[PDB]
Amino acid sequence: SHTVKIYDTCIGCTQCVRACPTDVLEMVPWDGCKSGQIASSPRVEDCVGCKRCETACPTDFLSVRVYLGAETTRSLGLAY
Amino acid sequence: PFPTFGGSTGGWLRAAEVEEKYAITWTSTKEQIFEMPTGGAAIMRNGENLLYLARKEQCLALSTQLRTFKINDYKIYRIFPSGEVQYLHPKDGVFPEKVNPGRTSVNSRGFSIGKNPNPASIKFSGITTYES
Amino acid sequence: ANFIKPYNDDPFVGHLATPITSSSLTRALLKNLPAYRFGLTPLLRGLEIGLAHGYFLIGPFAQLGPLRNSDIGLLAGFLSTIGLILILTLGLTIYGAAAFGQEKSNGSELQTKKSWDQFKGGFFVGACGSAGFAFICLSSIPTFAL
Amino acid sequence: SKNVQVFVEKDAVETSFAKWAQPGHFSRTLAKGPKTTTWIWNLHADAHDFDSQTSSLEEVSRKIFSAHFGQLAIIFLWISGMHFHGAYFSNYSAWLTDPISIKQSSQVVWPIVGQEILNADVGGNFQGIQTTSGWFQMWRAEGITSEVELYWTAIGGLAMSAIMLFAGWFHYHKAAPKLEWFQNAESMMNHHLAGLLGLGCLSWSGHQIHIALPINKLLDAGVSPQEIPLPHEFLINRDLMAQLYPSFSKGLAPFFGGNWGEYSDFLTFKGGLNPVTGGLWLSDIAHHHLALSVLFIIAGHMYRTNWGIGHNMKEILEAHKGPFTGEGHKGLYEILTTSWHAQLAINLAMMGSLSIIVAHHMYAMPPYPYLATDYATQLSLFTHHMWIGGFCVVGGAAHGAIFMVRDYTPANNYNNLLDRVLRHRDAIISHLNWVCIFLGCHAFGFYIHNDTMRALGRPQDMFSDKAIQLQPIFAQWIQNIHLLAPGTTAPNALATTSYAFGGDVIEVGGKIAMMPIKLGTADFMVHHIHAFTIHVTVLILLKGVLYARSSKLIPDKANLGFRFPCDGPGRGGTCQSSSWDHVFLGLFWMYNSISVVIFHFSWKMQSDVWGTITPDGAISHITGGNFAQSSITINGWLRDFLWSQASQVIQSYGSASSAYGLIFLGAHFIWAFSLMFLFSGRGYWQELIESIVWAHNKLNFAPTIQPRALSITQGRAVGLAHYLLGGIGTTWAFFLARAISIT
Amino acid sequence: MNDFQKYLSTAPVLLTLWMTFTAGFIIEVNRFFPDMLGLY
Amino acid sequence: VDLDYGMKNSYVPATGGDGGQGQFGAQSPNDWRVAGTSPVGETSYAGAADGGEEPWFAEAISTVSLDLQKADETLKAFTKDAAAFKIEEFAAEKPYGFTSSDAAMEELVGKLGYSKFLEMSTKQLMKTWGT
Amino acid sequence: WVTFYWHWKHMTIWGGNPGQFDESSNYIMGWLRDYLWLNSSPLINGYNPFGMNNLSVWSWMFLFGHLIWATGF
Amino acid sequence: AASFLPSILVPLVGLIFPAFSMALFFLYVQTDD
Ligand code: CLA
Ligand code: CLA
Ligand code: CLA
Ligand code: CLA
Ligand code: CLA
Ligand code: CLA
Ligand SMILES: CC1=C(/C=C/C(C)=C/C=C/C(C)=C/C=C/C=C(C)/C=C/C=C(C)/C=C/C2=C(C)CCCC2(C)C)C(C)(C)CCC1
Ligand SMILES: CC1=C(/C=C/C(C)=C/C=C/C(C)=C/C=C/C=C(C)/C=C/C=C(C)/C=C/C2=C(C)CCCC2(C)C)C(C)(C)CCC1
């Protein structure tokens, strides 16, 4: 459904993965930052488009960007 | 192993029976009252507990509440109409907020957000700048 | 005593067993209604439903319509009812096409194309005929006086 | 020891001006300092939210008690000013002598910039603004007579204001009560229901029986105000009272004995309205308060305190449970004794509801001398109290929601009434939605149907008293019941409680005070519209309370708070999903509801009640009875009401009513101004600000407190505020200007 | 005193005082020199 | 367990503006667009639940559930690869008297259950398997 | 604003009283009272409790417009 | 006579035509080619 992309400016603060309401983001090993960790979006099929993740990023400009797109039952948050 | 609840009009509907359904499980050390996302209050059982919901978010919301009770053994599954089940969370046994060796990066762009291509350049291509 | 319990003993379904939802009265009435009754064929189900709905529809038009005070008011009311029945029938036809498709197999399941078509046909006949019956009845009203 | 005791902490807070110089001290976040303009706005928006400023109920409670003293001080100063202005800047004396001709005025403008035109020739060799609050009538009923007395009550008011302010300081800085003291509901109710209300009524009855009644009788008879004996004289010379009411001769002997009948001279159940003044008989009012006093005092002895006898509210609440309601009312006591928001909800709703009742009962049964004939005052009071009520009711709902989000605890509420309500919320809201649609389609449809029919030249097909008719049969029936009550179901009464139900036309000064108000098809149509408006308001507000903590869309709304902008652009859009936003939308519907009600009052009265009657029986209503056949269509309201009754404001220039014209226009402007906050978004504004800041920077200067655009929530608030001010303001001027002329 | 002076130095308070002064002087000018649509 | 059951759906990702099937598929294999209620003694939604004498509320009769025993299997299958990576690393770090990966797994999971095994660092594992 | 100006100016000219615009156009109340209020009398009386005329269709549309506008809100 | 056309066409254009058109659109948007 929606598209979430992570950029090299990430600092591995883990704040984004701790804010997702649907477990779409994970922290994976990396060497480009001091923390030695980067964020990934393995399960974008469950993204609802809340953008809470973006609100949590501390980088000058979001290192995590959510681009809204095709809509499915899951993305539209339909319990019915 | 269902927790003690008296019923509500905010439970699941047909989609749960014809499209898809979700289920969370956890273990408790005491019988305590929790608030369910559907609306209302329920009492968990002293031991294994199972509850069904219609959305993954509803399940994960309850997990947050469970963490307050110091319960961190919760598991979430998706049950399809035919009976097939998918284990969803914690996927690799380790919570996502904790780096676990063995997980590969996905959807990562190796440059600052400002280095994406110009829209005009990719015209009549079908791709987007952020996917280019 | 608790008169409200989880439906089907499922504490997590979105429904409750209240006196209104599950009482002998409600159960009995709904079981014997033409829509859910056992044994009725698709055509007969439609017929009964149509007979019922057509009889009460002539009233509103006949007594409150544009030509209510005219000597031909009842006739006009009948025509108006027939028009409404046609509109409703179009809806039924269209619904069936979209919901069921083009070729069916199960058969004798109100929820199939063939059965639905039969149901629709019954409704039309029953409704129009019922409206006609009301026309005949309203032509001369009995005072039931001895 | 004793269940009910007084616990107070001495010298709790030091009095100093240090915190005054540290704006934002109350908040941890704001205290750090200003970095953007948002800090400024937040300072003002979180000033009185004590729950977020401290985590101890005792502290929150202490602040509330003291803050209340502050409001009381302000109220006292307000009343004091009014009496003073009525002593030094009014024509009360002249009006007192000729109430029918002289017009009430208590405000005078300085002769600056032609504003003097606003000083009208009210009468009595006096020029000023015609006031419409009804002070003169009240003072006459009390028996003021002089302006010296008004001065003294003003001084008393100032003194009282000071005492209250001291009390606030004292009970917060020097003697602050502890939480245990506050949590004594039974005692509080016993004291407030027997002391505040019971003793209050009894005391008032004393004034009315010994001072007001006698003086007013003399005034009505014709005695010149100067010739009426001073109040103290009546209190001392029993003989004087005996002349007026021939029972004081017997003294209090009849009272101690069981012969209360002898006091029938001043305690009566006459009913109806005094023919001379057009107001309720004071004798009846005196008996009213006396009777109420006894009732309240008795009621104040129902709850247990420190002597065993009495009721414990907890027990009463818990016992009331049934087969369909689980644990019943268990858990409510704790909620109402541990949550200020919950208490405010109930109290605020009831207070607003009372105001609406006051509005209805105070016009049908005019309570003051020479009030009914003053159409301006009547209209002003009805509308004023109708509004105050609407706001308060919506406020109750708001604080109810704040409770659910901040104080509700699942553990303390298992299978109680509250829990069960939140467990079938879908059913409740679904049904109410339908009810609203049903009512709205049918009620408003009637009007649209009629408009179409009249325009198509088919008047015989309209829902009118001359065609298809929709008569209010039930109401017509109740009216008859109330009309025939005197002498039957109410044997000892002498007349109808109100002439509205039926009776004769009471006229004072050639003007109609009250007349039977009849109900027909038009009334049916409008009443059902009122139902629709109120029902929709409840839907929005109730939905907010029930879905405050969670919803299928946002399962964790509680954590987000009571006032969050949204959850995001996802799920298809989650804008305005907070409980605060439900209150935001509810206020708009409350505005609509009240507006229609006040308009109904204005047109119905000016068409079927108010007017003049000749010496013989010829009644000429102000508008001529147009309500019956014109209020059945929307075009009628636009033409026979708004367009026609607005001729006064639009043509007020060059007159003492010019102010209303200017305000009418100003209000329209503010209403429109608000639509820019209600339709736009923060994004556009923030970007515009960026460009503007560029200019300032280009000239080597820019504020360190970086300029930022108003928050999403504040934008909505600013819009609603201006919208309400503009709309209400417009009607305010429209009504007042029209009323001045009709009077 | 020092602290009170700081409170009196706050933005809201100073604005009100300044505007009251400005308004007053404008009103006073019109009181003594009234009705002017031009410098005569 | 068909780990691809969800992935095997009718959804076809679009060119641009779609995240894709993700990790567990984007949509249910089954179509939600089924029929409504049916008369007594009849069924509508294919493998639907008979409403008995209350066909009107048949959709409220659950037929989809989770077997606790089966739940264990799905947990193991979906986390098989992770377990493999974990044990592999443990093997790489010169295990004391190592035998076979599988054998080690059984021994290491005999103790420390399985969930605990998945959440333990190779170092902790080696310490645990010192014996 | 542009259209209102053209109409009112021309209306007064056609009516033979150009002075009304010349003097009342200086302040806002003039526009509301001498233009919108005064010239709305024919329209609001297209259909009344006493009959109807050829301006009925125009009257009805006027109210119809108000509805759509507010519904937009 | 052409004069009768207003009473024969208007009923069709304003009632029959719109209905069939709406029906066709529904069938078109509810079909899964
Ligand atoms: C004139 C402007 C206008 C109108 C007509 C409406 C209409 C409505 N609002 Mg609304 N609203 C408005 C302005 C308006 N709003 C503004 C400015 C705001 C901002 C505060 C809101 C905020 C608001 C909220 C927050 C809520 C509403 C709700 C409602 C609905 C009430 C239910 C009802 O009576 O249905 C009847 C609707 C009618 C328009 C009645 C007239 C229609 C005819 C006369 C009846 C017959 C027509 C028939 C059905 C079809 C004819 C066929 C043919 C015409 C094609 C209704 C749809 C409530 C709602 O949805 O709950 C139900 C609700 O919760 N409104
Ligand atoms: C919504 C309010 C409303 C109502 C009640 C009416 C009523 C009426 N209109 Mg009118 N109209 C309205 C709005 C309304 N109008 C609006 C908004 C417009 C503008 C578009 C018009 C334009 C209009 C025209 C142009 C004409 C009318 C006409 C009529 C009359 C014919 C009635 C008819 O044929 O209905 C038929 C009704 C039905 C077939 C069904 C009625 C609903 C049923 C009774 C509900 C039953 C519910 C049931 C109790 C549920 C429980 C069941 C359980 C116990 C088993 C009637 C007096 C005609 C006339 O002669 O005027 C007098 C006419 O020519 N109307
Ligand atoms: C509800 C309260 C209330 C209200 C609204 C009014 C309103 C009015 N009174 Mg009135 N009055 C009141 C109570 C009230 N009064 C009381 C209780 C008394 C008894 C003392 C009086 C005694 C009184 C007299 C004797 C007179 C008025 C007059 C007036 C009118 C002119 C007001 C004025 O001075 O303008 C001009 C305003 C000023 C000169 C004040 C200057 C503005 C100050 C400096 C701004 C405030 C500074 C700010 C708070 C700084 C903050 C510091 C921080 C520590 C808080 C006005 C209509 C006058 C009138 O009608 O004359 C015809 C008049 O002569 N009143
Ligand atoms: C019989 C005793 C008595 C009386 C008269 C009151 C009266 C009042 N209480 Mg109260 N209270 C009492 C006992 C009493 N209380 C007890 C025992 C408790 C503890 C359980 C409380 C706890 C309490 C709280 C927690 C609060 C109140 C509040 C209030 C006020 C409500 C606002 C109102 O109606 O304004 C009416 C206003 C007036 C009538 C103005 C006059 C007020 C003075 C104080 C009356 C005192 C008597 C007076 C001097 C007459 C003496 C008679 C003499 C002339 C012969 C009101 C003044 C609220 C408030 O706002 O307090 C500030 C509030 O928050 N009370
Ligand atoms: C008994 C009355 C009463 C009391 C004690 C409270 C008390 C409270 N309310 Mg509440 N409320 C009430 C009535 C009341 N309310 C009513 C009637 C409504 C419906 C409109 C509301 C709606 C409401 C909302 C929606 C919210 C509160 C909140 C709050 C809390 C913080 C208030 C705050 O931010 O202070 C600061 C106070 C202000 C900034 C108000 C200043 C006045 C503004 C600027 C409007 C002025 C209009 C003015 C009269 C127009 C003059 C025109 C002129 C210029 C020409 C506090 C517990 C807030 C909260 O967070 O609760 C926890 C919150 O979100 N209330
Ligand atoms: C151009 C379109 C059009 C036309 C030609 C008509 C024509 C008519 N309308 Mg009307 N209407 C329209 C649009 C139109 N409407 C719209 C858009 C609305 C919504 C606002 C309405 C709402 C409306 C109401 C509420 C009412 C009418 C009524 C009427 C009838 C009054 C005259 C008469 O003799 O009644 C007397 C009636 C008769 C003599 C019966 C005539 C025979 C009928 C019409 C046969 C219909 C069969 C038809 C083929 C079925 C359609 C099939 C489908 C596939 C299209 C007349 C037939 C009134 C009426 O009585 O309705 C029948 C009435 O109450 N109309
Ligand atoms: C309120 C209520 C109720 C209900 C009621 C109702 C709702 C009723 C209805 C009724 C109805 C609604 C009925 C109907 C009827 C119908 C009919 C009776 C019909 C008939 C028809 C016929 C007989 C035939 C026809 C025809 C045809 C078929 C075709 C051909 C032609 C002809 C004509 C032959 C009761 C009492 C139960 C109880 C209480 C509650
Ligand atoms: C207007 C006003 C005011 C007021 C004033 C007043 C109100 C005065 C009066 C005062 C008074 C003048 C009071 C009085 C009181 C009295 C009383 C309250 C009485 C009581 C009684 C009793 C207590 C009795 C008892 C008993 C009995 C029961 C019987 C037997 C014997 C005995 C003795 C035991 C002020 C200025 C504040 C402010 C402004 C406004």
Strand and helix layout:
This is part of a larger assembly, with eight protein chains of eight kinds.
Chain F: H1 68-78, H2 80-92, H3 101-110, H4 115-118, H5 122-128
Chain G: H1 2-15, H2 19-24, H3 28-37, H4 41-44, E1 47-48, E2 51-52, H5 56-72
Antiparallel strand pairs in G: 1-2
Chain H: H1 6-29
Bound molecules: chlorophyll A (6 copies) and beta-carotene (2 copies).
List keywords for this structure.
part of a larger assembly, 8 chains, A: 80 residues, mainly beta, two-stranded antiparallel ribbon, 1 helix, 6% helix, G: 73 residues, mainly alpha, 2 strands, 70% helix, binds chlorophyll A, binds beta-carotene, PSI_PsaI (chain H)
- Class computed from helices, strands and strand pairing of chain G: mainly alpha
The protein's oligomeric status is part of a larger assembly
What does the radius of gyration of chain G come to?
Answer: 15 Å
Main β-sheet of chain C: number of strands, strand sense, barrel status?
2 strands, antiparallel
Structure class of chain C: mainly alpha
Count of helix runs of chain G: 5
Q: For the largest beta sheet of chain C, what order do the strands appear in spatially?
A: 1-2
Question: How many helical elements of chain C?
Answer: 4
Ligand inventory reads: chlorophyll A, beta-carotene
- What is the overall silhouette of chain G? globular
Order of helices and strands of chain C: EEHHHH
Order of helices and strands of chain G: HHHHEEH
Estimate the global geometry of chain C from the Cα principal axes. Answer: extended
Q: Could you tell me the strand content of chain C as a percent range?
A: under 5%
The percent range for helix content of chain G is 55-70%
